[PDB]
Each structure stands twice: as structure tokens, then as C-alpha cells.
Swiss-Prot record:
GN (gene name): PGM1
GO biological-process terms attached to the record: carbohydrate metabolic process; galactose catabolic process via UDP-galactose, Leloir pathway; gluconeogenesis; glucose metabolic process; glycolytic process
Highest taxon of the lineage: Eukaryota
UniProt protein name: Phosphoglucomutase-1
GO MF annotation, one: magnesium ion binding
Source organism (scientific name): Homo sapiens (Human)
Length: 564
């Protein structure tokens, strides 16, 4: 059980093993009930690595703890070994947060990693499973590589595997495996799930300033909800053990294979337990993370909700409370196109570049690799820095703690001050789920044709009292300044002279039929307007959005599925 044979298994190809930008995500049953399904996909990844580079290569491997993950890691090891891959670094018990994997790939200069996560999607025997491939910069495999893996998956006929190799995932250290009639060994190193990521955070943030903030009778009282996913141990070992926060601060911080039977997806409904806890008024700061730790929700005293578009703006405005940025400086700011323009106000005032990208990581990564991007955020609960090449939920929480420690204000008072200084970008996202594809497609084509007409710029819409004048309308296009690529049809933008925007996108998910995403960003600068209810302040533009798009007529929906 340390000396294993290499064998070749004939297999039948599948046709649907397309890695996408976030990994191949299938129902767990599919993986269990489809012969060699996982085997085929893992082999197809490894086949992208030139056989001459495998011995010297290391792959980082870990996941979010969901059901089926360890069985997948075992067969990843069995296949990487047979294929001549030299070394695997695997998090203890298979557990590695997505930011941790990106951390470790970059630190040890691995060729890439394979993350066993489906992020926010439910886990368990009746849930989903995902296999994500990252490359040597720590970030997601780009299109040209995922295309290759797809190609190989569709015509694969055999894979190589040591069926007898079994890694003990529970014990730290190097396990060596001697392969029959192979000179070099195959080496697995089990590493503590948290250490290398904690060591990175210890250099990024002022752990002494934070321990002071979090400890003692005058402590900042926090509740940090890992939603039964991967970031749990990271919370316990960093916020509690190392930074001295009371152990009751770590909520749902024990990874569960079914994530507790719920979606590890941070927002005001999936994380309603945190919200109600914060509602009591006992704690100053709340936060929630998704299954793999790259998304985060930020809550203040009494459940005050910092929406992700605002969060990245507040961090930008106070970025030098964070030692990493004092020493790198601020290379640039970025948000996805549908994210609110609050960040732009900070970037304009402090005169730092604001990159407005299509949705998707690759655009942030390219700018990061160019040394042009320090801080990025997305309206979908995503905040990141160029410290790694994934977004990082716990990083965003420690950024907020750093800012709370230097500001010595509540979360809410910080936001009120932010809104008084930069004005407020009220923001909401409307989700229309599983509308008929023909109707949604017609809605988009009709709206775009309407926007394209020479008279549309300048058109006026009463609210009333307020008049919105369209300054610009288009289907968003982005020419990437690094890889040369052009991304078209990235979303319909109605840009108004007052700084406000309406944005329509069709969701790229594989759900039954289309999902419509309507983003409303209404800028207000006035004192009597910036502390009103957001949904009340957004209602005029919501009315304009639905009228100009004829959404109800094209879909039959009188209300969104979700309001965020
Ligand atoms: Mg995620």
C-alpha cells in the first residue's frame, strides 16, 4: 500500500465535460452514476501538461468539503501518479479554500491546481459537484486551456491510473508512492489547510492591530458565518485562535458535506440566520462566505447591509489602513460593468484608474498580471486584490476590520460618511429566473435596436420631479488591454446624465431557459436623499427600466424572482 502498479483503463468519452470559467459542475449523481466520468475529466486535464514537464510539476489539490470531494481527490491522486505528475500538495482532509489554492500555487510555483468545489451551489448526495482547474498564476484556467480539455474529453479512449494508490488525507507530511517500473517516485504532501493562507494574511494585514481590535472588554464584537463551508477552519484558526476573537464569533465554521442542507451562498436570505443574529444589536460586525470562500457579505450593527458595490468602494476609500497597500501602493481599481459606480467616485476623487470590465475573472487577472489592478469588486458579493488570482472573502473581512480599527466608527457610520463625501450609488439587482428563452431574447434584441437609434441619446424620462436624460446607450463591449481580445454583447447599458444607469444582461447559466439580470444604479448627492430607503429611491429608474424594455410584455413577469 505504498508500492503501486500503473494500469490503463479503456473508457468511453462523454460529450458534456465542458470546464467553463468556474469549472465543470454536474449533479453529484451524474459523477457517481456515469462510469469513469470523473476519471475521464481528470485525465483530460493532465493530458494538457506536456509529458516532459510532469515529473518536475506540482499540482495543488483541495476543495470545499462537499460530498464526494475526498473520493475525487483520491482518484485525482491515482491518475496524476500514473501519468507521471511528480508531486501533489493536498490540503489536510482535502480541505482548501479557493483563495488558499491560489495562494499555494503562487507560493510554491506549482503548475496549477484542481479545486473540488461548486462554490455557492448546494452540496450533499443530492447536490452538485464541481471540478475547477487553475493554472500556474494561481487563477482559473483561461478559455484556450479549457477548450483543449473539452476537446480531449470528447474523444478520450483510455486513461492511466494506479488503482491501488490510497492517500491518507488526514495526516500531515510527505507520503511517497513507488510506482512499478518507474524510477522517480510520486510524492504527496499533506499541508495544514490554513497555514500558508494565514501566513499570507499575516503579511498583508496588521495582525497586532487586529488582535487589539478583537480582544478585551472594549472589543469589536463580530459574528463570522462560514455557512458550513470551507472558510470555517480559516475563521477559527485566524480570527479566533490567532487574533483572539471569542470562539462564539465563528458561526457555522465546521465544514459539512451537505453545507448543513442549505446553499453556502452569502446574501440576506440564504444567510438570514446571521442577519437575525446581527439584528439583535449585540455585535458590531457580521459577515458570510460562500462554499469555497471567494465571496463575502458584509453586515453592520443591527443588520445594516453593506452592498458589495459599496463595500469595494469603502475599502478603496480607506485602502491605506491595510499594510499591503501602504507598501505596494494602489496600482488601480476595477469593477465589473454591472457593478454600481460607487467605486468610480472614489477612483475619480483619488485619481486612480477605474477599469470597467465584463463579468468574469479573466479581465481582473490580466490587469493584475500587468501591475495595473490593486483592488476589484463585483456586485455579486465579490471583492479581491492582486494578492492572489482568485477573489477572497475572508481577505475582504480582514480589510473591513483593518478599516474599522483605524476609523473607530461603526460600519453604518462609515457608510453614511462615505455617502456624504462621494454621494450614494443606490443599487439593486433584479433576477428574473427561468423566463422563456424566446421572450427574453426578443426583449434584448428589441431594446438594443431601440437604444441604437440616433434619437435615443438625449431622450428624457420623468420620474417625476426628477428627469433622467440618457447620455449613452449601447451593448457593452470591452477590448482587453493585455490579451488583445474583444468581448462583445456584454450587456445593455442605459447611462444617464445624472450618473445613474440601467443595465440588462442575460445570465450565462445552464438553467432551464434564460435568466434576466436587471441592475439599477441611481446616483444621488443630496443630503435629504442619501439616507432614504434604497428600494424607494430606485423605484423611478425601475419603472423606466421595465417600461423601456417591455419586460412584463415580453416575459409575463410582473415581479423579479430575486431582489438583491
Ligand atoms: Mg465561490
Amino acid at each position: 500500500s505504498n508500492m503501486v502498479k500503473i494500469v490503463t483503463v479503456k473508457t468511453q468519452a462523454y460529450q458534456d465535460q465542458k470546464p467553463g470559467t468556474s469549472g465543470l459542475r454536474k449533479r453529484v449523481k451524474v459523477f457517481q452514476s456515469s462510469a469513469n466520468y470523473a476519471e475521464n475529466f481528470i485525465q483530460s486535464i493532465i493530458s494538457t501538461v506536456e509529458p516532459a514537464q510532469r515529473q518536475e510539476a506540482t499540482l495543488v489539490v483541495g476543495g470545499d468539503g462537499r460530498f464526494y470531494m475526498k473520493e475525487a481527490i483520491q482518484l485525482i491522486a491515482r491518475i496524476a501518479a500514473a501519468n507521471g505528475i511528480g508531486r501533489l500538495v493536498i490540503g489536510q482532509n482535502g480541505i482548501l479554500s479557493t483563495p488558499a489554492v491560489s495562494c499555494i500555487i503562487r507560493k510554491i510555483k506549482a503548475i496549477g491546481g484542481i479545486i473540488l468545489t461548486a462554490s455557492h451551489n448546494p452540496g450533499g448526495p443530492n447536490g452538485d459537484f464541481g471540478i475547477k482547474f487553475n493554472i500556474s498564476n494561481g487563477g482559473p484556467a483561461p478559455e484556450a486551456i479549457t477548450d483543449k480539455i473539452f476537446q480531449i474529453s470528447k474523444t478520450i479512449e483510455e486513461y492511466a491510473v494506479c488503482p491501488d494508490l490510497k492517500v491518507d488525507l488526514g495526516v500531515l507530511g510527505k507520503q511517497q508512492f513507488d510506482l512499478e517500473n518507474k524510477f522517480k517516485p510520486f510524492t504527496v504532501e499533506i499541508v495544514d489547510s490554513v497555514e500558508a493562507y494565514a501566513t499570507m494574511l499575516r503579511s498583508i494585514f496588521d495582525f497586532s492591530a487586529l488582535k487589539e481590535l478583537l480582544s478585551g472588554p472594549n472589543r469589536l464584537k463580530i459574528r463570522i458565518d462560514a455557512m458550513h463551508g470551507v472558510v470555517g477552519p480559516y475563521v477559527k484558526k485566524i480570527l479566533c485562535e490567532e487574533l483572539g476573537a471569542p470562539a462564539n464569533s465563528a458561526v457555522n465554521c465546521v465544514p459539512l458535506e451537505d453545507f448543513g442542507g442549505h446553499h453556502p451562498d452569502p446574501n440576506l436570505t440564504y444567510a438570514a440566520d446571521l442577519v437575525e443574529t446581527m439584528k439583535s444589536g449585540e455585535h458590531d460586525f457580521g459577515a458570510a462566505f460562500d462554499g469555497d470562500g471567494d465571496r463575502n457579505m458584509i453586515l453592520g450593527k443591527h443588520g445594516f447591509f453593506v452592498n458589495p458595490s459599496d463595500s469595494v468602494a469603502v475599502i478603496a476609500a480607506n485602502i491605506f489602513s491595510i499594510p499591503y497597500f501602504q507598501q505596494t501602493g494602489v496600482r488601480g481599481f476595477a469593477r465589473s460593468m454591472p457593478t454600481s459606480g460607487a467605486l468610480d467616485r472614489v477612483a475619480s476623487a483619488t485619481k486612480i484608474a477605474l477599469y470597467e470590465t465584463p463579468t468574469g475573472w479573466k479581465f481582473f487577472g490580466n490587469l493584475m498580471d500587468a501591475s495595473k489592478l490593486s483592488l476589484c469588486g463585483e456586485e455579486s458579493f465579490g471583492t479581491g486584490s492582486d494578492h492572489i488570482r482568485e477573489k477572497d472573502g475572508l481577505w475582504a473581512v480582514l480589510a473591513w476590520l483593518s478599516i474599522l480599527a483605524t476609523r473607530k466608527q461603526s460600519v453604518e457610520d462609515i457608510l453614511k460618511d462615505h455617502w456624504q463625501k462621494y454621494g450614494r450609488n443606490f443599487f439593486t439587482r433584479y433576477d428574473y429566473e427561468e423566463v422563456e428563452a424566446e421572450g427574453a431574447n426578443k426583449m434584448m434584441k428589441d431594446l438594443e435596436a431601440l437604444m441604437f437609434d440616433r434619437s435615443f441619446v438625449g431622450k428624457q424620462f420623468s420620474a417625476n420631479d426628477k428627469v433622467y436624460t440618457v447620455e449613452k446607450a449601447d451593448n457593452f463591449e470591452y477590448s482587453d488591454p493585455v490579451d488583445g481580445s474583444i468581448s462583445r454583447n456584454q450587456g445593455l447599458r442605459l447611462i444617464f446624465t445624472d450618473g445613474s444607469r440601467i443595465v440588462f444582461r442575460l445570465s450565462g447559466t445552464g438553467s432551464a431557459g434564460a435568466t434576466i439580470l436587471l441592475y439599477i444604479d441611481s446616483y444621488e448627492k443630496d443630503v435629504a436623499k442619501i439616507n432614504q430607503d434604497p428600494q424607494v429611491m430606485l423605484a423611478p429608474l425601475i419603472s423606466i427600466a421595465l417600461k423601456v424594455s417591455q419586460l412584463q410584455e415580453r416575459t409575463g413577469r410582473t415581479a423579479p424572482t430575486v431582489i438583491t
